[PDB]
Amino acid sequence: EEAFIYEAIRTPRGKQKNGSLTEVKPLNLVVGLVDELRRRYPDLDETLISDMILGVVDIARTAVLAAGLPETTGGVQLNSGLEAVNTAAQKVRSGWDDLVLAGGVESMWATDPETNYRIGFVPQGIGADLIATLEGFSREDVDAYALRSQQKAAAAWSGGYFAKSVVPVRDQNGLVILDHDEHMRPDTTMEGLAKLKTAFDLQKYHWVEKINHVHTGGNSSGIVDGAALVLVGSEKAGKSQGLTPRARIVATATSMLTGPTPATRKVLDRAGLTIDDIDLFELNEAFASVVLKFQKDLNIPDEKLNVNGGAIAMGHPLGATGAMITGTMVDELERRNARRALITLCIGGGMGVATIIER
């Protein structure tokens, strides 16, 4: 039993505290995606949707009720060792569930020194600086990575790449509240990044005399509000409801900011694939050094990594991350007419998840 992605949508991402989604309750952010799916697929028999799976870093069960999904639909809420998309594929592959909604939601800690904005866990930030210290990534390296995120995000937005999947959030009278990723800073420059103050100032690594603190509010991802859902199902369930499969989930696997690397090696193993076989690599951008280390570890070509930008630009939506970056790849495989993407992030108490999809 193969698991296919039939749809993958998401909310634009709102800045927390003083942004556009601050008054919108997380439930309503999730129910609006269900309502968009219904507009897209009005004939859909929801009796086949066995679970809504929500990552939150009783909303899954409450969301089912507020959306008016069937009472036969369960709610699964995830913070240990699992991930939403990975869980939905295993359910469907097991052959006892027919359609699953999988994704997550975030709605308002490490903080950047000048803006007081969440970026987002203190010891993670120190680890990030340790990685840069151990691996020899300079302040200019991590800033150059941040710049390329903002640039690729800007190119993706202005190029229309996200038009199909990014669903405007509207108020209870229909006025658009937010239709774009407002955390983006497309005016970002290397000179601007260099003035920013470092934000995170160990005995296992006893040869390190001093940590070279290089991460800031500009090369670490700010936390943003948002929701995302992926509709996963069997072949028979989708051909039942006249849905067109958009990608196949080839393999998934699971394995303190270094987790994505081995989970990626493992998923590649399970699928009988190598790095050369993957057209696009998508890794959540929690901190620039962590992405650079992943790239350095696996010899990942620059032109294949986070090709439409990542969380440094658009924001880190915590629980919603997995469904957002999956959908970003489902869409980008189609725009490129490319074949395979590998999507990976932290679960993540030290633990990573990696998933290979096929167009």
- Residue ranges binding a copy of itself (CB under 8 A): 51, 53, 58, 60-61, 72, 74-82, 89-91, 93-96, 251-255, 266, 270, 349-351
Question: Quick one: tokens of 333?
Answer: 């495989």
Which among a copy of itself, Cl ion, none contacts residue 296 (Cβ within 5 to 8 A by kind)? Answer: none
Which among Cl ion, a copy of itself, none contacts residue 123 (Cβ within 5 to 8 A by kind)? Answer: none
Which among Cl ion, a copy of itself, none contacts residue 148 (Cβ within 5 to 8 A by kind)? Answer: Cl ion
CB nearer a copy of itself, residue 89 or residue 184: 89
CB nearer a copy of itself, residue 9 or residue 78: 78
Tell me how far, at minimum, the Cβ of 280 lies from Cl ion, in Å: 12
**β-strand partners of 178:** 169
Which among Cl ion, a copy of itself, none contacts residue 255 (Cβ within 5 to 8 A by kind)? Answer: a copy of itself
Residue with tokens 């080839």: 250
Task: Give the single-character DSSP code of 276.
Answer: G
Q: What is the DSSP string of 76-97?
A: EEE-----HHHHHHHHHHHTS-
- The β-bridge relationship of strands 3-10 and 247-254 is antiparallel
CA distance 253 to 300: 19
CB nearer a copy of itself, residue 27 or residue 177: 27
Residues from 135 through 154 that contact Cl ion (CB under 5 A)? 148
CB nearer Cl ion, residue 139 or residue 148: 148
CA distance 314 to 224: 8
Tell me how far, at minimum, the Cβ of 100 lies from a copy of itself, in Å: 11
Which among a copy of itself, Cl ion, none contacts residue 89 (Cβ within 5 to 8 A by kind)? Answer: a copy of itself
Question: Quick one: tokens of 43?
Answer: 């004939």
Tell me how far, at minimum, the Cβ of 93 lies from a copy of itself, in Å: 4
Which among a copy of itself, Cl ion, none contacts residue 252 (Cβ within 5 to 8 A by kind)? Answer: a copy of itself
Tell me how far, at minimum, the Cβ of 217 lies from a copy of itself, in Å: 30
Please give the angle made by the CA atoms of 12, 300 and 56, to the nearest 5 degrees. Answer: 35
CB nearer Cl ion, residue 4 or residue 281: 281
CB nearer Cl ion, residue 231 or residue 342: 342
Ramachandran assignment for 174, one of left (phi > 0), alpha (psi -120 to 50 degrees), beta (any other):
left
Question: Quick one: tokens of 289?
Answer: 């050094």
| Residue 293 is a binding residue for Cl ion (CB under 5 A) | no
CB nearer a copy of itself, residue 13 or residue 266: 266
CA distance 321 to 311: 9
CA distance 329 to 154: 16
Contacts with Cl ion by CB under 5 A: the residue count is 1
Please give the angle made by the CA atoms of 278, 279 and 282, to the nearest 5 degrees. Answer: 85
Which among a copy of itself, Cl ion, none contacts residue 82 (Cβ within 5 to 8 A by kind)? Answer: a copy of itself
Task: Give the single-character DSSP code of 350.
Answer: S
Cis ω for the linkage preceding 127 (within 30 of 0): no
Which residues contribute to the site for Cl ion (CB under 5 A)? 148
